[PDB]
Structures are given as structure tokens and as C-alpha cells.
Amino acid sequence: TLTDRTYLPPLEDCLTGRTVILSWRLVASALEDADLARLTSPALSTFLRDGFVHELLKHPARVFEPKDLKQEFETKTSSGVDTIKKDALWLADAVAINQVAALRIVLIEYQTRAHSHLVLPLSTQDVANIQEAAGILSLLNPASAVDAETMWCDFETEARRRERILATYLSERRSFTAAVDALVTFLLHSAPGQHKDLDSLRRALLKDAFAFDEDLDVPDRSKLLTMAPTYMNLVEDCIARAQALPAKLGESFKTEAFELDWLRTAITEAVHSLSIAFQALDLDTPYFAPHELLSEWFELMNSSLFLESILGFEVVADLAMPARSLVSAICLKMLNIDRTIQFLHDFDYPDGEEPYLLSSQTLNKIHTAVTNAVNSGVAASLPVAFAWSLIVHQMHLGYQERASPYDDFLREQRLDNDIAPVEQIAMLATSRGQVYQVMSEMALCLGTTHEAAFRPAVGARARLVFQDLLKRAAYLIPYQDEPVFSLLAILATGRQYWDVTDALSASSLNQVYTDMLDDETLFTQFTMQAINRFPYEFNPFSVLCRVLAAALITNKDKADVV
Amino acid sequence: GKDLAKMIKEINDMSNTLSKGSKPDDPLTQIVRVLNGHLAQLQWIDTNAAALQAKVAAAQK
Amino acid sequence: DEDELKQKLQQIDKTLNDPAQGSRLEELWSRLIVLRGYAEDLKDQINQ
Amino acid sequence: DVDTYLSNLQTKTTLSMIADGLERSARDFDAFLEENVTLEWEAQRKRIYQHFG
Amino acid sequence: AALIDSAACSAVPWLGTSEKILSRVALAIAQAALDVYESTTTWRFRSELDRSILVRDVVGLMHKLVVHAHTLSSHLTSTLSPAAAHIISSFLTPPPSASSLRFQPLLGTLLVALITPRATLYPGQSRILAERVTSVLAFCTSLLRAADFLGQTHIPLQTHLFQSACLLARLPAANAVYRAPVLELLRALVEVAGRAEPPSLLGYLGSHAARSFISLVEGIDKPFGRVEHAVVTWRFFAAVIRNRQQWMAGCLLTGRVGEGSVLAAAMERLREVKSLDVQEAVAVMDFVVSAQNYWPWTIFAVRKEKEVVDALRGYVRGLKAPGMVMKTDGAAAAAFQARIAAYVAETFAMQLYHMRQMRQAEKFAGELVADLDYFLREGVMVWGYNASLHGNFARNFAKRFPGVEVDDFKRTMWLPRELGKGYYYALEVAEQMLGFDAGWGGVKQSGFRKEMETANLNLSLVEAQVSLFHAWEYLLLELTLSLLPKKENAAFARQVLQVVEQCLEANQRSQPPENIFVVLGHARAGLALTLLQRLADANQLPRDVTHLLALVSSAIHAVENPFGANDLPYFRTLLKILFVVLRAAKQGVAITQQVLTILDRVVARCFRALAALVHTAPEDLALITAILQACLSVPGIEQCQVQVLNIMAAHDVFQVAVALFS
């Protein structure tokens, strides 16, 4: 009893305009800006409160999995419809999406023709007016500018219409990904002191989709923890489409601009999937993730070269840098260096989930993937490789004291007698502080400042893996200026003075900060040493005090620490 | 030109209907119109005659 | 002699393709519709 | 009907035409007062005509 | 910016300062900010985000400086007055040599915004660019309002603002957030184009671009349906229609009748006013009136073709609209309901005038007269001013704030006054100006904030009552001519007499202030004057002057006798009112004792005053003569002639009459 009425209203409303379908662009904008009115609007409220949208956002693959919905398509297109149906059929034949999704995208593009036309190059009269205003400032393109008549006559053509439809399809894919990501973010890390309507909507959406009830002493995370593989599997199709464009698509449309747009869309979709996975993982921080999923994920990354094949181009650097940072973040998250070391040193069973530590095959796969990544000569694998090297360095010693399953791994790839490869990898990673520099860059692209690529909460929860890595790595490599500047660039991110506000947020966002005063490893090694090295080493203590005073303004329990 | 004509027509419609709109078949708007015609023609005569008068000054060399 | 032709053409074309000149008509039309409604109302009022 | 309405229409705010009712009233009141004072003079003369007998 | 914000709080920590010092510092800061704004168009930044943040900051500073100067007209805004004045003189009438140096930054910002690609990542840069665009738009709006004020006939910035709107027409396509601010700016440009044909906007926008912008904006926030962006788009549409814009108005009303035009949705919203938010209903009705008064032939035609859905809803609203809504659940909704009723009455009156011009107003008027109950309840009666609480608040504010007065928070008419809690008192600034010391916040949401909000709501209600007064005045004036035949005379005469009595009672009861609202003297007298005029022309009065004349006599006694003062129109209209009243009485004993007061104390005193002043006068003397003539005709005087001989002989009027005759 889950229909697409609210999801895909009747075509008569879309055509007559009596009800504009809530495209994913508007939902993504409303979830990104956190607007109260829009989020509490009746239309969007009914759209999100529907179980159909919940099932769709919990299974995005089904939204574009190739299926045979000819009957539904014919029933919807029956009772300017001929052109709409023709475009929908052409898109469904070109791309593997279903006919319903193609029809919906075509309807959305039809309703959004005004924007697609206004985002086009301006006319000649406009360029003349701009030149008259100007009496630097040369962001025009008069060599290709044309009049409005020839711009409109070319807009109504068939090739241009199909190109605009494909561009709108890619934009709607990106908007759906961003919208579901922001929705998961707002539902998991909801900020306190929000309007009553927002809290009620959050509770309703949770109880309807994942049965996550705050009044229950133990909510049902099952349906929320099952969102990691749902996107880790879709990343496969994302990279497959990135490395190969649709074959059924006409060759005339496969131009340089179209290829670049497709690559950027695939990279954005992969980044959003990785972010959703990282969120679903950090939702359960202390417990381990199912090793059956990490095995396949590490095999995927091994095969794809950590998405370096699609990101190897020089025209996607702005999207590659954040993509590589998020890949490293999710790798360090699923690695759980902190919990892994706790288990290796404590030997007590967590009971939350079985880790990959009991499977030698997963260890072999991870080791060969790290080896291939380091041999390929890629920087994105620097922090992941370093971390893995540390883990192996702790497993070696664990074996020396016992001289059980991990022993199989340690003896399978000839890693028991010699420790040369991991040591050389760590040496190369620490040489010239390349690992620290790349970690600082990732934190900058995964921070809270305006330079960050994601929302403030996203970066706040992403810096946790790097902070834990520095925590467990601090007692191994000695205190030195490079790790300190790295941690400073991580925690502070390089924000300005006016980027400090007393806006109370969720405790989760403040976790990454309070951990400095919660865990003894990050308290007696960085904070105490930073205080002791003053005013001799002024920048670390100064930046630490600055970030602490900026983050603990509302925290009355730690307001007098600075 | 066409649009301008449409405009003028509409203006005429509004003025005529506003001034009188309970007998559009009446002799007033008739006299008005014919009399306007005469005005225009008289203007033409005046202007062109003035032009010819000006043209004679050239021969007065 | 083509230059002279396109010069004249450019001049007249430039004279036509102006914001103000084109705008005046549009402004005029609404400016007329105002009087249209006003007159029709005042007419209906004094339609006795 | 609509044709004649659009033909005899004037480009001007409607709230100004209805306002003319005030002017018209101010111009009618004068004649109305003159009729009052004439029917009054008349009445007076009548009552005098009934006083003499 | 922080220094200017701190100086804005001139109602207070500050040991070692003075007005002159702060004024000089503010002037220097303004000069430095203007120099930075003029020089930023030449620096080469490593990235665009730095220049964007700089432009945002300087624009926000200039906007906060401009708004603070015109938001109030008291001395509180004198510390930053030389600075605001400087910035305005430099951004409204700059020299022709450096005129483009101050405008190129805004053009470059708009260009960078209209050609920035859409990206799901980097939300910081996105929000910074959005705030920069909103600040630039607010600054443009502030400059336009400043130019509109102070009487600026030649605005050289309008030529550049037109070509900036040329880009702002496409800018919203990149981000929906810009849809409201952009429209606001456009509305302010149109307002400056009204009080100044204007430059054709279609020449700058373009046919295709203009049609695309219209098709994008015609749907008022359809996917969400918010109230703020709705009122914004309705005020924008009303302003665009009110001005000389004709191409855009036609394309927005017709839609290329109306099938996808703004009106097709405005009717859909009007047919659900019973449940729609009253706040948006006011803006919708304002748009309807703006489209009717300037483009009636289309709006009225479409409404008559679809009157079956609008007249029924109007009747429903009228019948179930109580008069005294304060006592019931709701205090701020009273002003909104009054404004909605006033707009509905105005629209009904306009359509009735159009129908009368078309000779089709009989049945509609006969059906509408049965819906005037809310008018009879809360129409001409403006006694809901409640001067008691206003005076109490004024005294309480003058006792706690000796330096700052309650009248100091009066708006300078810089921005269109909202019909909310900030109609007269500037609450948006007061919240940050008086919230520094204890007393503004108050326990349990008490103190001066709630009282100021209630006073603003009462003032908005009074304004809505005045609007309804004008609307019902026009409606009844046209109905008196419409309902000339001998039918429905009973209810008609009852309503007219009730209106006259309410007006005469309000003329005696507590009056509103003259500095806030318009003087009512001579504004509501001609209404009853013409009403009684037409009712006498119809000769359908119940000769019930025994009580109606008492209010007129009390008014004439308590008017201070301004026979020849500046209040000459008021005296003349009162004289005409009493003339028509005593004439109606003549058509009808207990009347003579009640009408001898005018013959003894009124006519003689006014005649003596006129004779003494004349040593203007002709018409007043003729009116007094007509009054006496029509008053000496009442039947009750033909027997009390004995009793009146002495009162008429006591003043010796014959001597002064013969003297003036000489």
C-alpha cells in the first residue's frame, strides 16, 4: 500500500501547474539551508512523511535499477503529452533507468525550463549594456554571443532539448543524493533548541522509516545501520558509469562537455554515497561494522584504485581532493584504529558485531589492496596505508608475546619473519611530512570553516577518524612539530576570528573538541605538552585556547577550562 | 505598425465608448468623425499650400 | 558599397533595438489599460 | 458590450473617477439649497395668502 | 561595522566619549569604507571568496549605516547622521568622472553570481555568496528608498540599476534564495520610477528573458507555500502594476483572460480566505486592488466571468465577521481582519461602479446590501483607539526614560509602513536599542515590549478602520444613487441613519492624534452631508431628528467656535449638516424646544462673529442666512413666535444687518 501519488503526482497537475512536483533540487536546498518554513511546509511535510519516499531513500538503487514498468508508464501517460512521452521513452532506452523515473525527470525538466533558459549565455544587447556600464571585469564571452532570436530558435531544437534533458537528469541525481544525505544528517545529528515543528517532523520521519524512537531506551538502529551497504553497493555502479558512458546513447551527444558533466556528476554521486556511509557508520562509533561488507568494500577499492582512475584527470581536482579526503575518512572509519587497538590489547569481545579481525581473508585482501595502492603512487592512500602499517606493527608484537586467526594472515603473505614492507611504507609516508600535509588538506576540505567542502556537522564528524589516528599514533612516533601543526590544522581548520558564535548545537558536533579533554591519550600528550611548551611554542597553545574558547561557549560544564 | 494600429483602435474604442455608450449608431460620433476628417484634410491643404508658398520664394531670386 | 548598406542597417537596427524605445510601448499599453479600467468603472458608475 | 467598454475606456486610475462623485455632490448641493429656499419663500407667501384670506 | 553597530545604541560603560567624538569617528569610518569600496575594483585576489567576503562586509556596513539614519527621525540617529548623509550624497549624486567607479563593484558581483556553477559541495562558499547577494540587494533597495526620499528628481544611479536588473532577472535561476530579495529590489526601483514614461524595462530585460522571468515568478512559492515570500511577491506585483509599466503588466495579467497568469492563482487563494492566513490575504487583496484600479477591464471581466466563486466567499466573510474581535480569542488578528474587510469593500465598490457604468449593478447591489453587517458594526466608528492604554504607556515610558520620549520612535516614512506590530513604533530597532537594561525583556513576556506591540496593533487597527471608512463611504455614496427606486427603503434608511449617528458620536468622543493619523475634521462630515442630501432628494426620512440633532448641537458647542479660523471647511460642513438636519425636521410639539437652541445661541453668535470680522465671508454669510431661513420654517415655531421674539431681539441683529447693508 505504498504508491507514488505524493512522489509522482498525476501528469495533469504537472502540466496544468496546479501542483509543482517537489523535485529533489528543492528538497536538497531546503535540507542544506535548514530553512524552518520550507521544512515545515505542508507539501514537503506530506512528501517526507510518506512511506513511499522513505522506502525510496532507503533503497536508492531501486530508484534507477533497470526494471520493466511499461504497464505503469502507459497507465500514467494515459488519462503536450506526446512529446513528453517520446522524451521519456528515449531517455529510458538510452539510460538503464526505469520509464517512471525517466517520465518524472522529463516532467521536472519541463517545469524547470525557465531556469535552464535563464542560465544560458546572455544576448548581444545584454553584452552591450554591460559594456556601457563598465564605461578586470572581463568575465564575458562576446566572441560567441548571439542575439536572442537565434538563441531561442536553437533552444527549441531537438538536440539541444535532449542535451538539456540529460543535464537536468544529472542535476536531479546530484540533488537526490545531496537531499538524502542532508536528511540523514538532520535526522541523526539533529541540533537542540530547534522549533517544535522540526522536532515533531523528525520524530515522525524516524518512527515511520527506521522506528528510531527517542522515548525508547534502546532505539532500533538496524534499519539505520543497514544504510551503509545500500550505498557501498551503489558506488559500484557509480564508478562503472564514470569509467564508461552509456552505450545506447547517441554519439552526437557524447561531446567533451557532456563527458565532463557526466564525470562530475558521477564524482558527486560517489562523494555523497561515501558521506552517507560515513554518517551511518559514525552513528554507531564504538561497535564494529560487519566484516562481510568491509571485505567487499576493500576489494572494490583495490580494483578501482581508490577511484584514482576516474579522479586521475586534472579537470576534476576541485572534486577529486574532497573525494579523496572522504574516501580516506570512510576507510579510517571502517578501520576503527582505536577500537581495533583496544581489541588487540584487551582481547575482550565487544559483542556489538564481529570484526574483520577474525577473518584472515579480509586481512589478506586489505594488505594486498594497500600494497597495490602504495605501488601505484597515489597520495590518497597515505593515511590509510600509514594506519594499516600501524595495525600490522601492533599485530607483529601481539604475535611475539604469543610466540589466533590473524596468525594465518601474518603467515600467508610472508609477513611473520620480515617486517620490511609495512616499515618502508610508514617511512615513505612520514618522509617530508607528506602524510601530515595530506591529512591537513583533507581536514581543510572536511572541516567547518567556509573553506570546507561539506556542512559543519559533516566535517565535525569526519575529523573524528583523523583525531583518533593521531591519538593512537601519538604514543608511537614521538612528539614533533609536524604532527602538532597537523592536529592544529585539523581541529582549527584555519577559520577566521568572526567564525565564532554562541549557537548551541548537538553534543555530537562538540565531541571532536571535547575529546581533547576526555581521553587521557589526547590530554597528557597534546594539551599538557602544548601548555608546557609556552610561550616557547606559542602557536599550538594559542590555537588550542582559541578553538576551545570558540567551541565551549555554551558548554557550561567546560566553560571555565580556557 | 500593426500593434500600434491595434493600440490606436483600442484608444478610439475607449474614448468613443466612454463619451457615449448607449447608442453607438448615433449621429454625434458621426459628426465628430466626419468633422475630424475635414480637420485632417484642411490641415493637409494648409501645410502643402504653405510648402508651395515657400517654393515660390526660391523663384524670387 | 556594402559597408554603407550595413552602416545604415546597423544605425536603424541600433535605433530600433533600444531598451527605452522598446519599453515605451509596453509602458504605454499598461498606461492605456489603466485608463481602460478606470474609464470602464467610471462609465459603469454613470451608466444611467 | 465589452467592445464598446474597451473603446470608450480611458487610461487612468479607477479610484479617481468614483471620487468625482464628491465634486458632483458639492455642485448639486448648491442647486438643492436654492430649491429649498425657493420652496420656502413659496411656502411663506402661501401662509401669508392664507392669513389675509 | 561593529563600531557603527555599537554607536547605533545611543540610548545608554561610556565614560570618556561625546556626541561630537562619535560623529567624527563615524564620518572617518564612512570615508574609509567608501574608499575601500571604490578601490576594491582594482585589487587582484588569489581567489574570489576573499573579494566576495570583502564586498559583503562593506555592503553590510553601508546598509546598516543607511537604514539607521532614516529608520527614525529623532535625535537618537544624530551620531551617525553626518556619515549616513555623506554616504548618501556619494552614492546618489556622485561626480560624473567617478560615477562608474562606485557602480562597477556591484556589476562585477552580479556577474560572478550569475555565472557561478551549481555545486552540491562547499556549502560555506555558497552561503557566503548568498549573503553577499542579499546584502547587495538590500543596499540597492536602501539607496533607492533614500533617493525617493528627500526629493531627488534626477537619479543617475537608476541608469545603472536598470542594467543591473537586466542581470538580476536571470540571477534567481542559479539560486531560489535570491527570488525574494531580487523582487524586493525591483519593487523599490519601480517605486523610484513612479515618483520621478520611465525607462522601458522591456528594452533592458528582453522579450524572451522577460517572458522567462514572468513564467518563473508567476507561481507564488508553489512547492512550499510560505507566507513571507508570498507577501513579498504580492507587493512586488502590486508595485509593478501601479507604475507605468504596461508591457510587463499585460504579460503578467493576461499570461502571454488569464489561464496561467498570476490572477489564475490569486483567485484560487481568494476562494479559500476562510482558512488562509490573514497575513497573506491582505497582500493578495492589495494585489487585486492594484490590478483593478489600473487594469480594470481585465480583472473585473475575469471576476464577473467567475463571480460564482468570489461573491459567495465575500458574503461568507462578511456575514461571519464580528465587529468587536478584541474581546474574543485574538488580538493581532483584528487589524488584519479589518484590513481584509476594507479591501473587500473597496473591490466591491469598484466593481459596483463599473457595473453601474455598464448598467448592471441593480441585482448585485441588492444582494450585497444584505452583507453590510460587519460595516454597521466596525465601520465609521473609529472609537477603538483606546487612548487610555496609549497614554498610560507614554507616561510609564517618560517616567522611566526622562531623556528618550515615546514619540522619538516614529518612523520617517522611509519604508512602506507595515500593518503589523511596527506600524508606527520601530520595534526592529527598539529590540536592540532598549534591550540593554532591565525592563525591556520583562518577566513572563511583560514590560514595555508587549505594551508597545499592543499599541502598534491598535494603530494598525485604526488605519484599517480608516481604510474601511473610505471604502464604505464610496460604496454607500454610489449605492445612494443606485438604490433610487422605492424598494428596500426600510433597511436602507436604517443603515444610513445608523452611519450618521455613529459619525456624530465619534465626532464627540475621544479623537485620535493629529501627528500619527490624518485629522478627521472635515473628513467624515461630508459623508453624512451627502447621505442626508440624497435621502432628502428621495424624501424617505423618518423625521426622527428629536435625537439626531442633539449630537450636532453638542459638536457645534464643543468645537471652540472656529467660525473664521483655519478650520473653515469643518465649520462649513457642520453648518451644511445642521442645515439638512433641520430641513428634515421641518418635514415632520417636542421639536421646538430642541431646535430653538440653534436659533438662540448658534445663528446669532455666528452672525455677530461674521459681522465683526468682515468689518470667505460671503459664502459663510449666505450659508448662515440659508440656515436661518430653513430653520424658521419648522412647524413648532409658528406658535412659539412669542417665546422667540425676545431671544431674536436680545442680540439686536437688525442693527448690524442694516449697518452691513450700508
Coordinates of N, CA, C and O in Angstrom, one line a residue, chain E residues 234 262-276 280-289 292 299 303 309-314 317 340 343-344 347:
Chain E
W234 N 3.5 39.5 -3.7 CA 2.3 40.2 -4.0 C 2.5 41.7 -3.9 O 2.0 42.4 -4.7
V262 N -0.8 35.2 -13.0 CA -0.9 35.4 -11.5 C -2.3 35.4 -11.0 O -2.6 34.9 -9.9
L263 N -3.2 35.9 -11.8 CA -4.6 36.0 -11.3 C -5.3 34.7 -11.2 O -6.1 34.5 -10.4
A264 N -4.9 33.7 -12.1 CA -5.5 32.4 -12.0 C -5.2 31.8 -10.7 O -6.0 30.9 -10.2
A265 N -4.0 32.1 -10.1 CA -3.7 31.6 -8.7 C -4.2 32.5 -7.6 O -4.5 32.0 -6.5
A266 N -4.3 33.8 -7.9 CA -4.9 34.7 -6.9 C -6.4 34.4 -6.6 O -6.8 34.5 -5.5
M267 N -7.1 34.0 -7.7 CA -8.5 33.6 -7.5 C -8.5 32.3 -6.6 O -9.4 32.1 -5.8
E268 N -7.6 31.3 -6.9 CA -7.6 30.1 -6.1 C -7.3 30.4 -4.7 O -7.7 29.6 -3.8
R269 N -6.5 31.4 -4.4 CA -6.2 31.8 -3.0 C -7.4 32.5 -2.4 O -7.7 32.4 -1.2
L270 N -8.1 33.4 -3.2 CA -9.2 34.1 -2.7 C -10.4 33.2 -2.3 O -11.2 33.5 -1.4
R271 N -10.5 32.1 -3.1 CA -11.6 31.2 -2.8 C -11.4 30.3 -1.5 O -12.2 29.4 -1.3
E272 N -10.4 30.6 -0.8 CA -10.1 29.9 0.5 C -9.6 30.8 1.6 O -8.9 30.4 2.5
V273 N -10.1 32.1 1.5 CA -9.7 33.0 2.6 C -10.2 32.7 3.9 O -9.6 33.1 5.0
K274 N -11.3 31.9 4.0 CA -11.8 31.5 5.3 C -10.8 30.7 6.1 O -10.9 30.7 7.4
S275 N -9.9 30.0 5.5 CA -8.8 29.2 6.2 C -7.4 29.7 5.9 O -6.5 29.3 6.6
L276 N -7.2 30.6 4.9 CA -5.9 31.1 4.6 C -5.5 32.1 5.6 O -6.3 32.7 6.3
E280 N -1.3 36.8 4.6 CA -1.2 36.8 3.1 C -2.4 37.3 2.4 O -2.3 37.8 1.3
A281 N -3.6 37.2 3.1 CA -4.8 37.7 2.5 C -4.8 39.2 2.2 O -5.3 39.7 1.2
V282 N -4.1 39.9 3.1 CA -4.0 41.4 2.9 C -3.2 41.7 1.7 O -3.6 42.5 0.9
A283 N -2.1 41.0 1.5 CA -1.3 41.2 0.3 C -2.0 40.8 -1.0 O -1.9 41.5 -2.0
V284 N -2.7 39.7 -0.9 CA -3.5 39.2 -2.1 C -4.5 40.3 -2.5 O -4.7 40.6 -3.6
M285 N -5.2 40.8 -1.5 CA -6.2 41.8 -1.8 C -5.6 43.1 -2.3 O -6.1 43.8 -3.1
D286 N -4.4 43.5 -1.7 CA -3.7 44.6 -2.2 C -3.3 44.4 -3.7 O -3.5 45.4 -4.5
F287 N -2.8 43.3 -4.1 CA -2.5 43.0 -5.5 C -3.8 43.1 -6.3 O -3.8 43.6 -7.4
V288 N -4.9 42.5 -5.8 CA -6.2 42.6 -6.6 C -6.6 44.1 -6.8 O -7.0 44.4 -7.9
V289 N -6.5 44.9 -5.8 CA -6.9 46.3 -5.9 C -5.9 47.0 -6.9 O -6.3 47.9 -7.7
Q292 N -6.9 46.1 -10.3 CA -8.2 46.6 -10.7 C -8.2 48.1 -11.0 O -8.6 48.5 -12.1
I299 N -9.4 42.5 -14.9 CA -9.7 41.8 -13.6 C -11.2 41.8 -13.4 O -11.7 40.7 -13.0
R303 N -13.5 38.4 -13.1 CA -14.2 38.2 -11.8 C -15.7 38.0 -12.1 O -16.3 37.2 -11.4
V309 N -17.7 32.1 -7.7 CA -16.8 31.6 -6.7 C -16.3 32.7 -5.8 O -15.8 32.4 -4.6
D310 N -16.4 34.0 -6.2 CA -15.9 35.1 -5.4 C -16.9 35.8 -4.6 O -16.7 36.1 -3.4
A311 N -18.1 36.0 -5.2 CA -19.2 36.7 -4.4 C -19.7 35.9 -3.2 O -19.9 36.4 -2.2
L312 N -19.8 34.6 -3.4 CA -20.2 33.7 -2.3 C -19.2 33.8 -1.2 O -19.6 33.9 0.0
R313 N -17.9 33.7 -1.5 CA -16.9 33.8 -0.4 C -16.9 35.1 0.2 O -16.7 35.2 1.5
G314 N -17.1 36.2 -0.5 CA -17.2 37.5 0.1 C -18.3 37.6 1.0 O -18.2 38.2 2.1
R317 N -17.5 35.7 4.2 CA -16.6 36.5 5.0 C -17.3 37.7 5.7 O -17.1 37.9 6.9
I340 N -8.6 43.3 5.7 CA -9.2 42.5 4.6 C -10.6 42.9 4.3 O -11.0 43.0 3.1
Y343 N -10.4 46.1 2.2 CA -10.0 45.8 0.8 C -11.2 45.2 0.0 O -11.5 45.5 -1.1
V344 N -11.9 44.3 0.7 CA -13.1 43.7 0.1 C -14.2 44.7 -0.2 O -14.8 44.7 -1.3
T347 N -13.0 46.7 -3.3 CA -13.2 45.9 -4.5 C -14.7 45.9 -4.9 O -15.1 46.0 -6.1

